[PDB]
């Protein structure tokens, strides 16, 4: 017909924002290392420019990001169909299809069509096909407005087609449109609970019960989502600061003297290096200083060997009888120095063997037969009444230190250790001095033999739970408390530790000086061990399970310190109460939040602008269009835009426009004044300001140039330039709802029937379809209004057919309906109705179950008894009576 038909047009539909997500390899042998790959691909339907980015990864060249390659995909004739991100159900909107003619020397006569879709009321129906014919000048564009009303939510579809007469030219566009329910996206915080099974649960089990969300103001027939969030609460434990490296400089000393004094000098340097290694303080101390310190340790060791007697024991002089204590102290120092320098095993293990064979008595006691000359170097052992216990503990501690080094070389070692342990064990309770309780406490704890009353004695011997002390030299109390700290670490009694370490550090003892040997060695051994063993954080191992009534199987998650911040999420479409169970170590958080669509109380459109549009016949068809807008602000609006679309077959007066364009506060494009080709159907008037104190009004005339049955309403849209979303749209059309578009949108309000074509047999047939769950006689008690919904409160006068809802006679039920349906239903208070519907019409839950009046709901006016007396109401009244009697007495067939 000089045209291409609508059945023979394939609409463009492929519009990804990104594609070509492919991995390919270059295997073609190259020219100078450069391989050239040829690949075939299919350009999508979009009319735009693509950016193709390539990235390569070579085993020898590495990574290379190519420069972008642009490919422009273009046509000379096409439709540009631009839709909003979303539109609201049951709200009349105007979409625009813009037709483009980029041909240089050719005018186009085009027939454009919008396809019918049951999801939208439009001028095109299942049998009536909205088609227009328009003429597009060369190198120009043209907009085609379509007023529609979306009916159901979800991803719907809009498709418009076009073709030029006399040439083989067409184009179609098929895009999806997002339809959303009425109301506002809301969420409610249902629960926020602290998870801590250790503290909040019975025998370490915390069960938490969660209620459903209220959702009383929920929009009928909409989805909700309950979100369940779990997260861990990581807690750090504070570790006391290390002793600053600078404080230890004075401990790096040169060892000199004989058997005893050489060890006095060796002590501070060994323990200082040990402490600096553990706390990682060499960088700050001076990295290159460590080697000199090692050499001094080596020298101390080498010099000590000159006082090793043939028996492998030690004394101040080679002619002096060997000391039990000194020999045990050498083992103590050398065993720790094994981590620092090459120590001869045979020297160390020889000393151990000698202690065991020569100096351990049959009751397990170690005994001194030749006291050291430097009595000040033995710390709290000096003048200690509890001589056998303190020395045995001291020697036993040295043996434990050497145990792994001397394991294969001294077979008598484990039995000696056990024997010494037995003696300490049997005599511990009788101890009176805090020093001995501390040192023997440590010795027994190394063996796992400090329990019950002995453990209790050890702990309660501390004063203020932070120190072990006796009257006398304060250096002895520092030494003792250091032994006790080591015992505490051995027992892993970490909750008792912090006050003890605080007391020690508070003494500001940094070693060195006369009689400082044991205090210096022990304080830094204890504090080093503390840094090595103290935990940085609370343990976090939470096992969390939830049971939703909607499901059968537990959903279980574990919370860890490692991923404590990680947000575990679970979602359900059901609005159900449920349970959460928590087990294990540590703390966490549970939050429950339900997202839903809530009914609105006030208008959600035109919140920044007020827009009244009027259209009245003028005193060759002619009407005058008046537009009144006010800004809703504390200040006048800045530069704003009036986007106006004409009613079908209308065009603005010219000389009227020119008078507005000469207006000082307004502006009209010279473009939209140099036209006269049905392109005059859309118009933009630019406003410098929009007053906020009052209405800003303007008016002009419009001339009908084209007659047609289907006159589409015109539209006016107002907004400020900086915010397109803060707009307001009003539609306009002539009068003297009706007709055609209102009508098509009213169809799903309820079952439409022309009164006096409804028969008795017909009602009995339809009311008895399975699926029809309720049949009531109602009385409208009250009409109630919301922004988008009317709520009809019905008194139930008769339960003709009962379903799921066990409503009783005299009780009330609420029937909700879209505001668009108000005139169609024409319900009046105090009047009676026959109503029936499906199980799909139910909403909410007992005793808050509600009814939706939908497309399958029967709603019929039941005449009052006084009206029924009139001859002209007799048929309907009697039919209703016979209908009711039949349904109650015999029920639906079968």
């Amino acid at each position: 017909e000089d045209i291409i038909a609508e059945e023979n047009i394939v609409s463009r539909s492929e519009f990804p924002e990104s594609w070509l997500w492919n991995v390919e390899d270059l295997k073609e042998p190259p020219k100078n290392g450069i391989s050239t790959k040829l690949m075939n691909i299919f350009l999508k339907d979009s009319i735009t420019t693509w950016e193709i980015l390539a990235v390569s990864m070579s085993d020898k060249k590495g990574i290379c990001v190519a420069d972008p390659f642009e490919v422009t995909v273009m046509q000379d004739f096409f439709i540009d169909l631009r839709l909003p991100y979303s539109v609201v159900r049951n709200e009349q909107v105007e979409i625009r299809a813009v037709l483009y003619n980029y041909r240089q020397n050719q005018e186009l006569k085009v027939r454009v069509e919008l396809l019918h879709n049951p999801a939208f009321c439009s001028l095109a129906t299942t049998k009536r096909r909205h088609q227009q014919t328009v003429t597009i000048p060369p190198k120009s564009s043209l907009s085609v407005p379509y007023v529609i009303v979306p009916l159901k939510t979800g991803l719907q579809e809009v498709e418009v087609k076009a073709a030029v007469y006399h040439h083989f030219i067409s184009d179609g566009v098929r895009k999806s449109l997002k339809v959303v329910p009425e109301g506002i996206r809301m969420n409610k915080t249902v629960a926020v609970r602290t998870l801590d099974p250790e503290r909040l649960g019975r025998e370490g089990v915390q069960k938490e019960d969660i209620p459903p969300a209220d959702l009383s103001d929920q929009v009928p027939d909409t989805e909700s989502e309950t979100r369940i969030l779990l997260q861990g609460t990581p807690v750090a434990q504070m570790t006391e600061d290390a002793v600053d490296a600078e404080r230890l400089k004075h401990l790096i000393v040169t060892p000199s003297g004989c058997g005893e004094e050489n060890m006095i000098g060796m002590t501070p340097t060994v323990i200082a290096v040990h402490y600096l290694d553990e706390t990682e303080q060499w960088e700050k101390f001076g990295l290159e200083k460590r080697q000199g310190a090692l050499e001094l340790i080596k020298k101390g060791y080498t010099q000590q060997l000159a006082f090793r007697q043939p028996s492998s024991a030690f004394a101040a002089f080679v002619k002096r009888a060997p000391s039990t204590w000194l020999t045990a102290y050498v083992v103590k120092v050398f065993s720790l120095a094994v981590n620092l320098i090459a120590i001869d095993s045979q020297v160390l293990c020889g000393a151990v063997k000698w202690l065991i064979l020569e100096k351990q008595k049959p009751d397990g006691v170690f005994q001194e037969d030749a006291p050291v000359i430097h009595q000040e170097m033995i710390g709290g052992l000096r003048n200690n009444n509890e001589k056998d216990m303190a020395l045995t503990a001291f020697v036993l501690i040295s043996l434990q230190e050497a145990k792994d080094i001397c394991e294969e070389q001294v077979n008598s070692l484990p039995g000696s250790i056990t024997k010494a342990g037995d003696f300490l064990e049997a005599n511990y309770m009788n101890l009176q001095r805090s020093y001995t309780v501390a040192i023997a406490g440590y010795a027994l704890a190394q063996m796992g033999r400090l329990k019950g009353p002995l453990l209790n004695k050890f702990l309660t011997t501390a004063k203020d739970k932070n120190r072990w002390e006796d009257p006398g030299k304060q250096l002895y109390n520092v030494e003792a408390t250091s032994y006790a700290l080591l015992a505490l670490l051995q027992l892993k009694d970490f909750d008792f530790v912090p006050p003890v370490v605080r007391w020690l550090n508070e003494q500001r003892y940094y070693g060195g000086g006369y009689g400082s040997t044991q205090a210096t060695f022990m304080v830094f051994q204890a504090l080093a061990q503390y840094q090595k063993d103290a935990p940085d954080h609370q343990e976090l191992n939470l096992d969390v399970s939830l049971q939703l009534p909607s499901r059968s199987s537990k959903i279980t998650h574990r919370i860890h310190w490692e991923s404590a911040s990680l947000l575990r999420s679970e979602e359900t479409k059901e609005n159900e109460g449920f349970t959460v169970t928590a087990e294990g170590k540590g703390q966490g958080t549970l939050s429950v939040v339900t997202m839903y669509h809530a009914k609105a109380k006030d208008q959600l459109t035109c919140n920044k602008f007020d827009l009244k549009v009027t259209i009245k016949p003028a005193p060759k068809n002619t009407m005058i269009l008046e537009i009144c807008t006010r800004y809703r602000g504390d200040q006048d609006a800045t530069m704003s835009i009036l986007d106006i679309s004409m009613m079908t077959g209308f065009a603005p007066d010219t000389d009227d426009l020119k008078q507005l364009a000469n207006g000082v506060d307004r502006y009209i494009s010279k473009y939209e004044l140099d036209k006269a080709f049905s392109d005059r159907n859309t118009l933009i008037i630019y406003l410098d300001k929009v007053s906020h104190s009052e209405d800003d009004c303007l008016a002009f005339k419009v001339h009908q140039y084209f007659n047609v049955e289907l006159i589409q309403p015109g539209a006016v849209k107002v907004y400020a330039y900086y915010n397109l979303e803060e707009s307001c749209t009003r539609f306009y059309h002539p009068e003297k709802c009706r007709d055609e578009l209102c009508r098509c949108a009213e169809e799903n309000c309820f079952i439409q029937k022309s009164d006096d074509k409804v028969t008795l047999e017909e009602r009995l047939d339809k009311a008895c379809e399975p699926g029809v769950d309720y049949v009531y006689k109602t009385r409208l008690v009250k009409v109630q209004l919301s922004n988008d919904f009317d709520e009809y409160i019905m008194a139930i006068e008769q339960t003709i057919k009962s379903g799921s809802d066990e409503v009783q006679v005299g009780q009330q039920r609420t029937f909700i309906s879209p505001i668009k349906c108000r005139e169609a239903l024409k319900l009046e208070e105090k009047k009676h109705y026959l109503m029936w519907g499906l199980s799909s019409d139910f909403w909410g839950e007992k005793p808050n179950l509600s009814y939706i009046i939908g497309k399958d709901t029967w709603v019929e006016h039941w005449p009052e008894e006084d009206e029924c007396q009139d001859e002209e109401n007799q048929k309907q009244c009697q039919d209703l009576g016979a209908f009711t009697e039949s349904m109650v007495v015999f029920g639906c067939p079968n």
Binding site: W21, L26, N40, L53, K61, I63, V73, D80, L566, Y721
Partner: protein, 639 residues
């Protein structure tokens, strides 16, 4: 009399090839060498052990390569002891360790997404040489509050450096800037990130470009700020419509709109012109004194609407500096040390106010107007000056000399250079001279070694040792021979693709007393190499014209790269970039990341020989006691 020496980088990385240069100066016969790397300070581990032999054939110069395995934090620095035994003699050095094991780069298919859509992304796993590697990686997705919502552990083994991944964006979600954060699981403290925006949007149909006539505003320009607006459909056609333009001032993070600068203008044939008048700008602020605006910037917002009223697009141009001069001078490429009596080379970097390199700008040393030059494509001009043999510091002032400008509008800058301190005031120096043009792989750089010492000892210097640092590691080491009397020798250095994006050349010699003591003399230079890829990648049309193509039509894509390479692709609608053009992956950003991680800190030379080594990112240690000072700092020192 033999002196044994070892040279390694200043900072050693984990799981990266490292080289250790070994020299036996004045050695006879074969010298066995054992190189061991231990943990500091415990020596519990043998991190490395390698053997080699120094022979007269190799001129008693060799190397060993070693790799330090994955460690085992509180952020305290780790150290190793590097040790070399030459025959019986031990030379050792404690060296700082970086816990980084390479780079991760992240590419998203788009810059912006709607809820419901799927983020397609790729993680490229490379080492410090930007070569593909197979390792275990941890990946986190983060919401605009910084909370992780998704977490995965993946291996990139046998994947040729590419980890393909996806994440589904829920319909119900928080809008704004989301993040992808990834780390090698052996090096958890170096996290690599990228962002993507989540927003409810529709794709625009055209693009708008806002561009001022100058990339700055001169505060005494009575013409004000002139701006050109350009509108163009995504398919190439020009736009007819209307533009709304408004200006503002930026002062720190404070933005001050200028309401009186709001103009509405026609867009005809895709173009519009709009001016911010000087009077409006000055009346828009409270500070009467115009000079107080200097240091602040201007921004411009343009909103274009089609005549059909069918689409609207906003675009902004910010960071337009209010200045007194169109230029700024930087000495960030010039060594801060010189050798008295020898030429001193000035690399003067001139930029436009936005920070881009200025081109063909005349610069000149103030006081020596004779010494002038012309800035090149990279904004660098080279000025060589002759120095006196005094210890007096070099104060140098450079000015621009654009004849088109007035004197008040010329840029100026002053720097100071200190004399390189010789050993025991011996006045012995080494000076490296080099060419500074656009340097590209495949070419040869002539390195000039200029000696300056006493004639009584000059014959002792029979060679120089040189080292090339690149991408934070030792690329090559070598020897440049010298005959008696050769006070200048040339090294033909072949520039391969391994020199990208830059390198440092350190050279030194050593000799005996002259009072019996060992003297070490060093110098260094830093050289820029033209940015590209090591290989190459190009995408173009496999046609045959047939453009412009049509919706649905097949097309041929020509991909020219390097053999055996794996190529990954993506096609994106330009409208997306009209919405968001941030966080995109480019090669220059990669090289930027690499150059940030450089362990050398200065453009060259040094306070003394040890300074020369350390500033270049090297340790030096000899058996006779000469060595670099300890470096404890992962980062380069600050102003």
């Amino acid at each position: 009399s033999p002196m044994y020496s070892i040279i390694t980088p200043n900072i050693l990385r984990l799981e990266s090839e490292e080289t250790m240069v070994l020299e036996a100066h004045d050695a006879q016969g074969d010298v066995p060498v054992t190189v061991t790397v231990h943990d500091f300070p415990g020596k519990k581990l043998v991190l490395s052990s390698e053997k080699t032999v120094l022979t007269p054939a190799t001129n008693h110069m060799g190397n060993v390569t070693f790799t330090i395995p994955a460690n085992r934090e509180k952020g305290r620095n780790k150290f190793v002891t590097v040790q070399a035994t030459f025959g019986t003699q031990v030379v050792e050095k404690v060296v700082l360790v970086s816990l980084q094991s390479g780079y991760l780069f992240i590419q998203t298919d788009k810059t912006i997404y709607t809820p419901g859509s799927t983020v397609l992304y790729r993680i490229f796993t490379v080492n410090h040489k930007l070569l593909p590697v197979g390792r275990t990686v941890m990946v986190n997705i983060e919401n605009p509050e910084g909370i992780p919502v998704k977490q995965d552990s993946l291996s990139s083994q046998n994947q040729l450096g590419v980890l393909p991944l996806s994440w589904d964006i829920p319909e119900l979600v928080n809008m704004g800037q989301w993040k992808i954060r990834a780390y090698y699981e052996n090096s958890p403290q170096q996290v690599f990130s990228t962002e993507f925006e989540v927003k409810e949007y529709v794709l625009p149909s055209f693009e708008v470009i806002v561009e001022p006539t100058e990339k700055f505003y001169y505060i005494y320009n009575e013409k004000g700020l002139e701006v050109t607006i350009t509108a163009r459909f995504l398919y190439g056609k020009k736009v007819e419509g209307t533009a709304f333009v408004i200006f503002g001032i930026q002062d720190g993070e404070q933005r001050i709109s200028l309401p009186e600068s709001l103009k509405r203008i026609p867009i005809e044939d895709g173009s519009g012109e709009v001016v911010l008048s000087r009077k409006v700008l000055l009346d828009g602020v409270q500070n009467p004194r115009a000079e107080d605006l200097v240091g602040k910037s201007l921004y411009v917002s343009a909103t274009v609407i089609l005549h059909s009223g069918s689409d609207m697009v906003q675009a902004e141009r910010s960071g337009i500096p209010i200045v007194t001069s169109p230029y700024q001078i930087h000495f960030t490429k010039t060594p801060k040390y010189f050798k008295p009596g020898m030429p001193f080379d000035l690399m003067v970097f001139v930029t436009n106010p936005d920070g881009s390199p200025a081109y063909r700008v005349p610069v000149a040393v103030q006081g020596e107007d004779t010494v002038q030059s012309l800035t090149q494509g990279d904004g660098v001009a080279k000025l060589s000056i002759n120095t006196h043999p005094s210890q007096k510091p070099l104060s140098i002032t450079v000015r621009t000399k654009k004849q088109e400008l007035s004197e008040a509008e010329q840029a100026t800058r002053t720097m100071q250079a200190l004399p390189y301190s010789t050993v025991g005031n011996s006045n012995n120096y080494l000076h490296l001279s080099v060419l500074r043009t656009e340097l590209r792989p495949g070419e040869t750089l002539n390195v000039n070694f200029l000696l300056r010492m006493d004639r009584a000892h000059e014959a002792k210097i029979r060679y120089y040792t040189y080292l090339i640092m690149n991408k934070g590691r030792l690329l090559k080491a070598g020897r440049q021979v010298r005959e008696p009397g050769q006070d200048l020798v040339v090294l033909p250095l072949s520039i391969t693709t391994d020199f990208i994006p830059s390198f440092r050349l350190v050279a030194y010699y050593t000799l005996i007393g002259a009072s019996g003591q060992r003297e070490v003399v060093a110098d260094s230079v830093w050289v820029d190499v033209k940015d590209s890829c090591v290989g190459s990648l190009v995408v173009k049309s496999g046609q045959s014209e047939d453009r412009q193509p049509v919706p649905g039509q097949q097309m041929t894509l020509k991909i020219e790269g390097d053999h055996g390479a794996r190529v990954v692709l993506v096609a994106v609608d330009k409208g997306v970039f009209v919405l968001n053009k941030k966080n995109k992956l480019t090669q220059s950003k990669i090289w930027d990341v690499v150059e940030k991680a450089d362990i050398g800190c200065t453009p060259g030379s040094g306070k003394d020989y040890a300074g020369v080594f350390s500033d270049a990112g090297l340790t030096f240690t000899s058996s006779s006691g000469q060595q670099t000072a300890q470096r404890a700092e992962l980062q380069c020192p600050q102003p």
